[PDB]
């Protein structure tokens, strides 16, 4: 990758979510971060020799190991598409935080990051898309903006 | 007033794959076609065929995509905004893809996700979701929020 993408997974719920996540991730070279607990054990079927996985402990851990990080808040009160920001600086450390599949994100992160905040775009008739859809959309999209550099 | 998407499952295997499918449909006001056989018992605008041969003869004038990794340009390659327009985005079933013949016979219409030698394919709900959110993307959203 020369656009550095990470995709951050909180307490993730469902393996087969992950796994999918984590297939995404191989496929376009994009670090998989997963903050602790997780809903499974990582020797879970469901859920890898060519993904970079990186386990935390903390959000509050990856957000000291990354000082410099550029983080996006990917949830529902977000008030601007994901499409709406750049994500082609090739010095950054481009993050995408996403939250639980049935709770999302600390609450208290999403109202002090409001202006990094982004929303996929929806009916009414949902409540929200599968979280690994939602992840794979989030990465093309930085890909297709990066004319998918490194990719076939 | 909108633009008609339309996403088509051939012989869907895995309910899973098809039920997140449904839901990204009703999410985008997207039409889901599914091609029987499935490989399971049975606000989103669900379609059942007995063959894509069914889906191409009831929609003659639709302009129908396929994806595929024997495509040789991504599916942004396209414009999805026509407002006059039926369009299909057709995939194929989780472990064997779509009928080659098919593929062979349209390969100017074959759209292929990038992506690293890693990997053999994203995941099919994944994939499709990717391919409704590019055509929103090219509307900007409209009429969705
Ligand atoms: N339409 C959407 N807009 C922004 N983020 C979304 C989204 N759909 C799913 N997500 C992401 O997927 C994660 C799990 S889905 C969580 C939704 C849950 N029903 C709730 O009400 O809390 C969310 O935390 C968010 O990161
Ligand atoms: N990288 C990619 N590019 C284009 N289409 C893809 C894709 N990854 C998955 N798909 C779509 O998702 C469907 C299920 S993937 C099944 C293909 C299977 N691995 C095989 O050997 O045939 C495919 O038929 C295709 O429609």
């Not at 376009?28 to 607990?37: A, G, M, S, V, W």
């Not at 994500?87 to 049935?102: H, K, N, Q, S």
């Not at 929303?119 to 409540?127: D, F, G, N």
Request: glycine share 4%; charged share 20%.
């Amino acid at each position: 990758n020369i656009v550095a993408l990470h995709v951050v997974l909180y307490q993730p719920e469902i393996p087969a979510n992950t796994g999918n996540i984590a297939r995404t991730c191989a496929a376009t070279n994009t670090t998989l971060h997963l903050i602790r607990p997780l809903g499974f054990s990582t020797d879970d079927k469901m859920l890898w020799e060519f993904v970079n996985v990186v386990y935390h402990d903390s959000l509050e851990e990856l957000f000291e190991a990354y000082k410099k990080g550029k983080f996006f808040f990917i949830t529902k009160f977000g008030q601007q598409p994901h499409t709406s920001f750049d994500y082609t600086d090739l010095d950054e450390d481009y993050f995408f935080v996403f939250g639980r599949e049935t709770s999302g994100l600390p609450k208290d992160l999403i109202q002090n990051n409001m202006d990094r905040c982004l929303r996929l775009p929806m009916t009414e008739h949902v409540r929200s898309l599968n979280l690994s859809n939602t992840a794979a959309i989030l990465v093309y999209e930085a890909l297709r903006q990066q004319n998918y550099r490194d990719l076939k």
